[PDB]
From a paper:
ScFv13R4 binds to a crevice in each subunit between the N-terminal domain 1 of β-gal and the catalytic core domain 3. There are extensive contacts between all the complementarity determining regions (CDRs) of the heavy chain and domain 3 of β-gal, whereas there are minimal contacts between the light chain and domain 1 of β-gal, consisting of only a single possible contact between the light chain CDR2 and domain 1 of β-gal. There is contact between one Fv and only one of the four β-gal monomers, with the nearest distance from any atom in the Fv to any atom in the next-nearest β-gal subunit being 28 Å. Because there is no contact between scFv13R4 and any neighboring β-gal subunit, Fv binding can therefore directly stabilize only the β-gal subunit to which it binds. The mutations E358K and G207D are 16.5 and 22 Å distant from the nearest atom of scFv13R4, respectively. The center of a typical bound substrate or inhibitor (e.g., isopropyl-thio-galactoside [IPTG], shown in Figure 4) is located ∼26 Å distant from the nearest atom of scFv13R4. Because mutation E358K is in domain 3, and G207D is in domain 1, scFv13R4 binding can directly stabilize the region of the protein near both mutations. Our structure thus seems to indicate that it is the direct stabilization of the active site within each subunit by scFv13R4 that restores the activity. The tendency for dissociation of tetramers into dimers in AMEF mutants, and the subsequent stabilization of the tetramer by antibodies, is likely to be an indirect consequence of the mutation, because the epitope bound by scFv13R4 is located well away from the dimer:dimer interface.
Binding of a single-chain Fv antibody to Escherichia coli β-galactosidase (β-gal) is known to stabilize the enzyme and activate several inactive point mutants, historically called antibody-mediated enzyme formation mutants. We have been studying β-galactosidase (β-gal) by single-particle cryo-EM with the goal of reaching atomic resolution (Chen et al., 2013; Henderson et al., 2011). β-gal is a tetrameric enzyme, encoded by the lacZ gene of the lac operon, and it has been biochemically and structurally well studied (Dugdale et al., 2010; Juers et al., 2012). To understand the nature of this activation, we have determined by electron cryo-microscopy the structure of the complex between β-gal and the antibody scFv13R4.
Residue numbers in the entry:
A (entry chain B), B (entry chain C): 3 to 1023
């Protein structure tokens, strides 16, 4: 009766931050209740721990109030059979909302909307009579979003908030032998939502596991581990504090044993009863053991040395009541003298922020996915990850512990959408709610070695609540530093200056919360903390420009210990078309309102875990070996702090314009922080013209746990020499004929013919034989289909006049009209010479001026020479080159320049100069939100079909015009055009990326010279 | 229905620390909602604020569950008419429990006993229709102990915990015009009780006021004041931050005006909208004004300069929506360089701890009582008070603000009875509950100038919860320091070393939490904070010995800035006898179990506010003027920091053995921290024998607000000279006759006769004429009826073998038997000489040996000469002297020695040497728990009836034998004995008092010499 919906729902606990839970057990590290020490030691599975994951019955309602009392007693006819865990939006019930800042619901704390999507889950299951004789049977939900009430066998059990941490209830007295039934009612919105405003899809449900754990009556209630070291780490102390619940009987003992493999390293036994703590005594229900470990193997992301710790609760006669365990990693984390140290050396964090996202499963995580992510990261030169912005699925820590990644664990607290940001975090009334989001995290994850820093949440301004919570942590677990960026990045609530999007060299001095240039921030008066960016280098779409600038500061300034790129995966979701064809969806694609569109796609990898090209630029910049070339000696520097180059080979090689002349291989013997000298054999040197390039690669000959054999971990290339070509071509056998007309000029020579339209001034067509080559005339191009960064936050509604695109738009770039100023043909001794001039103007303003000369010679080669003039007072153009639509469509593209991957000017350090050959398909980058892409810089020669262009340029080539790109919201809607679109740039502006909501292109990468010159040679084979 | 007891009670919110309140409004400074600025300015009364204090209907139940649903709807036949506020134990419902540490209920957090005394209060009242048109009508309870549920017009309103702070609910929508009814159900025990384990009577009910406040819809929700100063305090800034609730309309304004009297000093006006705080902006519902004040009058306990601040919320057209106000005191509090400063100078805290206690009303406070207390304190040289151990009744701060006392405001948190002490305070699950006890206190009291330090609670060990809360405060209100003694007195949670019962010179090194000698504590390595004792000098019963030692350190060591004596009033309660006669009751006197007996009586004043003699010793030691005598020049030093001696006269005077020879009066002109020189007139000097004494007194000629005219604020006395008596008496005219017998020796001379019993060796009787003088023989006395300090915590059950009494008991002191060793009479030329010797022994051990000579001469004077030998190995005796029971009973006592008040050896600095004459009645000190009392030291002559004794001794005289004292638990049970009991001590051991649970008598005051000598002269007039 008092179990009635009617009664229960009445209190509206989900509209009250003063009730965060009802009858929930305390937090603690992961338990299994093994009843045999070996299983515990070997991490075998505990029969005392049962999963309730699977098929559950579910029914959706638009408001908690629309639930029928019947539900409590019996299933529902119309209840569907759903799989758990899952996100009900993933099943169709309601839509997922992709909003960033702006809260999904209306801001009226602590109220929530009356229309509040309720999901009723139920499960019928069996409890074995043995579980009811003794012990305690409790239930666990690893993640319920956002809040929920619970009934068992028609009785009300409890309530819980906090989507990202476990809620546990003792079912001990509601359970009946055999058949039991659970009724779980999950509310989408609650007062907890006010604290969960992270930039991500807004979903709901029982999205993490459900389990049953059977514990003895007298049991281990919690335990913590700690490791102290001596000056040189040659000796450690493992300290374990154990607490128990139940009746304390003198025959009770505890044994803590430390294994390393099969080998027991240390063991300790004792009975309950701690040291005197105060005037009343000590804890009789606790015991602390201390094990001495000589020459412990240390844990690090470089070498994840782990031990196993077993905690046995037994009686003195040797009888085991129960056992728990955890992996142990010996490491010390400290900030000392402005530096963050790990095991005594200073880290350089090569990290990334990662959300729990699956395109198919929404926010439900699985082992496979976790592992994939981990390996990609490790393969790509990452050390660390930040749990943006809440505690993750438990297994995560374990994997990191094991594979080796540093983890920053973060409280599930984000109130980004309040005004001001502080509003709740400065309010004592939210102190409790917040408090639980921090404390429980710590109680749960504190024993993992991978966790090296605690974070108070994200973007919730800076309030007195943070200060308190930060102090709490420091008191409770001084083993790790605390960080929080809110309120300016350097408040009293953080041990590290941890801004987001601070530029390297430029300051952004917003009122109250400026973002100084990182190099400058450190030397502000009185400042002494280390600086590590919590988010930097916004990887949204065609991005990552300038990435290297960061890497270089990091390397030059000690107190700049790296940062976390934003972010790992694109938060795109899968949708299906008219023919059961899938496609990547984003903000607002689910009729979701209000929404932030593409803003959910900032990953380095696509939702399927396939990489964006940016990923390489990272990989290379973050590489652990560094090179310098001096004469014919290569100096190698190791950035490893703990390990020796012991699975590393260096391959070297010399080549002249793509042609290999020499190769070597040399095994690296460099210690962490060491140098290795490498002298090269006498290097060949040819008479032939061209550039000679040295390229080196570090290879991992043997496979590791996260890499295959032959994995390349680093590389670098240098230009060694140049033999300039002092050779004049063979005087043409033939001579081209010029046929004039009033419409055009024709040039014929051989089967070849070229036509220039005298009215437009462009080369309108060309034939090889009877076949035409163009579909579109060759013409000047000064624009580009806007990248995400060019656009920023500019919308049709709300225009951002500062966004590059807006400027360009406003100035007429996109709609300027050419103007023939001149077009002449002249006959040279051995060639024809065409000469043109256009002016591009908009509203009587001449933006640019293009002046060319085409010169066709007996060789049947045309040489284009171009010279642009850009008005000082017009926004600098995105680019400067030509384009045209070719008639042909070939299978491959071959070029001699940077590649193989897409590379832009402020994003090309990872690319190598060489001869690349790839399929056309590979020259297009499927950024879900179409834009200019696929560029390759420093090209010297490009070959497509019978064409060959030569010079110094950047280019791109696909089946999509710039216009089509520019006009398609999703990549799935693009259609291949008639032939091949070719864009050949003499120059291209950088892509930026410091952030994606303001101009981020550094000046060095802006086409601001005024005068631009370039030349090409088009010809055939 | 869901309003039903049945439903409500179901959740058992009082057995859950996760629910501290339900539907309670936020905390804030005191509001009145004046609707006229002048009333506000002048503190007139607000018609918008109505008291519901008075006659209420009440009914008591043994368990919440025994309440009848009817109650919600209608009064109860048997409900009585009680007055509110009150403590129901004060009315008879149940008993008050006097327990210290040990919790009243059984320790099973968060559970409470099923038998849980519920008090149902109800009130029928009228609401004026106007209040319901608009605005908000809310209710306030200033104190409900311990927890409660609330209904209005049969509807459930909310719940609340925290006995010592206000709970407010919006009744706006439950109220009906005209007749309304409240039903309040108050639970004695709740999960809140675990946090309220203060050493005091355990009571319950609606013990502070009940009010109704009507506010506008658009109102002032909170406001704070702050004052900054310049280097020399010649200029200040008053800063007021105001927040409002309701709809924000551009025509809204705020005006803050500062008055000094009638004179407006400054005013400021502005509209809502603060400065940018973070990335989202500012508070639109707040405004901060800053007023400049030139040469502000500063507030201090010496001179409570106050201003009035008025906060008006109006529209721009000048229309007043509403006004609030508060008194403002300009002062700066800072710890700087190890010192605690007030307005730039370093305080010396002369303070005391005070509980809210009334012998009649239990824990209900009234203005009269508050005021009495204040004045007594100020009169007695106190500067400050500590709110042991919870927030006090609101008016308190106001009075302190006004009369001038420094206040330490303390959170209502004491978990003394847990094991270890830390148990809850270290538990994250209690963090929220604790949090509210701190935060609300601050939000409420933060604007009072008298509050200069915040305290986190008392005796709750040291947990991570404290650290967080301490940081919170520092963040929120950096204007004051925070202190907390738990966990060792010098933790990271306190800005001041604030121990309790630390001795001056001796260390008490308990494990974990030692108590170093205060002088030593300061120089412990790394230590730099100031030290102020939160409790020192346990004033239980006959106490305060050694008080001066403290005063002297305080004066010599800068970093020793004083302390808080423990405590102000005796927590005794009034009971009535068989004839409606009242008497002072204590622990366990209400059949209360378990209990701490007298432990509740440690005040300096009795519950009726009549002083214990200790009070003087304080007054004198804490005096603000200090003297030194050099020749005939008196040097006066002022300890005032801010004020000039401007109501001070110095009276001086010289006297020879009680006889006045000279007097002066001199006006003091000494500045704070200054010296004044005073040269005395040529001082007379007589030939006559005797001691010449100089005595000076400082007088307050004019009355102040807390003192009458002619109040004496200080004094000091010196001995100037001594003219020794070289005069031999006039050779006796007569000669005494000795008549022997086998039973005794008789001496006759004149009407006078003396008889010494030859079997016992004592003077058994004496006659003047036909009248006998003794009822009991004159005999040696080595014991005393144990003071509270002699006993300590020793009980009959649990004996404390270290307690003085125990030692004495065990050694046979109390039951030793005399032994005539010798008894002889001899005839001298002009006198008779008796000579005796006894041995006191117990179990064949001779404890002491007494050797006398009585010598009676022609003058009819007996001279007693005594010489004791004390065994090295026996506990030192409490005293050494004689006693006897006189037959007479006279009305007065006159003596020449220290007085006039009771004075002991380690407690006599406040006493003066002179001739005192008082009524017998005044020679007895009515300590509720009878013990040795009334002593007066340094006596040279004592007169009672026809007797006169002369020498150097300490003595006491009443109608109660030591034995009667020793055997009566309460003073009300003592009965006057046949005549007058006289105790004349050659020597007396000190009383101690550093604490009352371990030996506190300093060695200098212990009778440890072995050999003791003394002489008397008994005679008549």
């Amino acid at each position: 009766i008092t179990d009635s919906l009617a009664v229960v729902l009445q209190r509206r606990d989900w509209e009250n931050p003063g009730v965060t839970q009802l009858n929930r057990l305390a937090a603690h590290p992961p338990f299994a209740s093994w009843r045999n020490s070996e299983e515990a030691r070997t991490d075998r599975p505990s029969q005392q721990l049962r999963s309730l994951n699977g098929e559950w019955r579910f029914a959706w309602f638009p408001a908690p109030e629309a639930v029928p009392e019947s539900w409590l007693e019996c299933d529902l006819p119309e209840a569907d059979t759903v799989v758990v865990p899952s996100n009900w939006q993933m099943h169709g019930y309601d839509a997922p909302i992709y909003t960033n800042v702006t809260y999904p619901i209306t801001v009226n704390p602590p109220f929530v909307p009356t229309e509040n999507p309720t999901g009723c889950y139920s499960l019928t299951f069996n409890v074995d009579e043995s579980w009811l004789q003794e012990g305690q049977t409790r239930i666990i939900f690893d993640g319920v979003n956002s809040a929920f009430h619970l009934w068992c066998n028609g009785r009300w059990v409890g309530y819980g908030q906090d989507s990202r941490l476990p809620s546990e209830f003792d079912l001990s007295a509601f359970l009946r032998a055999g058949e039991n039934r659970l009724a779980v009612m999950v509310l989408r919105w609650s007062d907890g939502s006010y604290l969960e405003d992270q930039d991500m899809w807004r979903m709901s449900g029982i999205f993490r596991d459900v389990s049953l754990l059977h514990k003895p009556t007298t049991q281990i209630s919690d335990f913590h581990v700690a490791t102290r070291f001596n000056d040189d780490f040659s000796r450690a102390v493992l300290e374990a504090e154990v607490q128990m619940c139940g009746e304390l009987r003198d025959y009770l003992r505890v044994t803590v044993s430390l294994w390393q493999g099969e080998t027991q390293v240390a063991s300790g036994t004792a009975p309950f009863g701690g040291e005197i703590i105060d005037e009343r005594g000590g804890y009789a229900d606790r015991v602390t053991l201390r094990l001495n470990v000589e020459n412990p193997k240390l844990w690090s992301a470089e070498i994840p040395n782990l031990y196993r710790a077993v905690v046995e609760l037994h009686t003195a006669d040797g009888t085991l009541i129960e056992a728990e365990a955890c992996d142990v990693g010996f490491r010390e984390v400290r900030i000392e003298n402005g530096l963050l140290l790990l095991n005594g050396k200073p880290l350089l964090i090569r990290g990334v922020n990662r959300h729990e996202h699956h395109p198919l499963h929404g926010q439900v995580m699985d082992e496979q996915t976790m592992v994939q992510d981990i390996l990609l990261m490790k393969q790509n030169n990452f050390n660390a990850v930040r749990c943006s912005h809440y505690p993750n699925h438990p297994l995560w820590y374990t994997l990191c512990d094991r594979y080796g990644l540093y983890v920053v664990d973060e409280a599930n607290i984000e109130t980004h959408g309040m005004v001001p940001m502080n509003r709740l975090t400065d309010d004592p009334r939210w102190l409790p709610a917040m408090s639980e989001r921090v404390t429980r995290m710590v109680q749960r994850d504190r024993n993992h070695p991978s966790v090296i820093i605690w974070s108070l949440g994200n973007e919730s301004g800076h309030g007195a609540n943070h200060d308190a919570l930060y102090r709490w942590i420091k008191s409770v677990d001084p083993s790790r530093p605390v960080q929080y960026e809110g309120g300016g990045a350097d408040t009293t609530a953080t041990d590290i200056i941890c801004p987001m999007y601070a530029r390297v060299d430029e300051d952004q001095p917003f009122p109250a919360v400026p973002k100084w240039s990182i190099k400058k921030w450190l030397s502000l008066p009185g400042e002494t903390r280390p600086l590590i960016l919590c988010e930097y280098a916004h990887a949204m779409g065609n991005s990552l420009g300038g990435f290297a600038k960061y890497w270089q500061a990091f390397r030059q300034y000690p107190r700049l210990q790296g940062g976390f790129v934003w972010d790992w995966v694109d938060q795109s979701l899968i949708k299906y078309d008219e023919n059961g064809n899938p496609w990547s969806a984003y903000g607002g694609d689910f009729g979701d309102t209000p929404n932030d569109r593409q803003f959910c796609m900032n990953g380095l990898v696509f939702a399927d875990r396939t990489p964006h090209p940016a990923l390489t630029e990272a990989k290379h910049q973050q590489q652990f070996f560094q090179f310098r070339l001096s004469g014919q000696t290569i100096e190698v520097t190791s950035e490893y702090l703990f390990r020796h180059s012991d699975n590393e080979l260096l391959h070297w090689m010399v080549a002249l314009d793509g042609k290999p002349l020499a190769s070597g291989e040399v095994p690296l013997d460099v210690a962490p922080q060491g140098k290795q000298l490498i002298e090269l054999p006498e290097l060949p040197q040819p008479e032939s013209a061209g550039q000679l390039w040295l390229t080196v690669r570090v290879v991992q000959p043997n496979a590791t746990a996260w890499s295959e054999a032959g994995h390349i971990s680093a590389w670098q290339q240098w230009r060694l020499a140049e033999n300039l070509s002092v050779t004049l071509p063979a005087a043409s056998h033939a001579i081209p004929h010029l046929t004039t007309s009033e419409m055009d000029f024709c040039i014929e020579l051989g089967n070849k013919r070229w036509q220039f339209n005298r009215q437009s001034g462009f080369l309108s067509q060309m034939w090889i034989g009877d076949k035409k080559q163009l579909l579109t005339p060759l013409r000047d191009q000064f624009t580009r289909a806007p990248l995400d960064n060019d656009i920023g936050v500019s919308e049709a509604t709300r225009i951002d006049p500062n966004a590059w695109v807006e400027r360009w738009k406003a100035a007429g770039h996109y709609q300027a009209e050419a103007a023939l100023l001149q077009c002449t043909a002249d006959t040279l001794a051995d060639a024809v010479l065409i000469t043109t001039a256009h002016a591009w103007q908009h509203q009587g303003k001449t933006l640019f001026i293009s002046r060319k000369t085409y010169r066709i010679d007996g060789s049947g080669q045309m040489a284009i020479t171009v010279d642009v003039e850009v008005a000082s007072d017009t926004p600098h153009p995105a680019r400067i080159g030509l384009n045209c639509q070719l008639a042909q469509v070939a299978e491959r593209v071959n070029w001699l320049g940077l590649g193989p991957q897409e590379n832009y000017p402020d994003r090309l350090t990872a690319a190598c100069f060489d001869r690349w050959d790839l399929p056309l398909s590979d020259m297009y980058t499927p950024y879900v939100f179409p834009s200019e892409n696929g560029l390759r810089c420093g090209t010297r020669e490009l070959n497509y079909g019978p064409h060959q262009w030569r010079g110094d340029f950047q280019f791109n080539i696909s089946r999509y015009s710039q216009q089509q790109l520019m006009e398609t919201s999703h990549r799935h809607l693009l259609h291949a055009e008639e032939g091949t679109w070719l864009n050949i740039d003499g120059f291209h502006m950088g892509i930026g990326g410091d952030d994606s909501w303001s101009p981020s292109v550094s000046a060095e990468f802006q086409l601001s010279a005024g005068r631009y010159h370039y030349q090409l040679v088009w010809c055939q084979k």
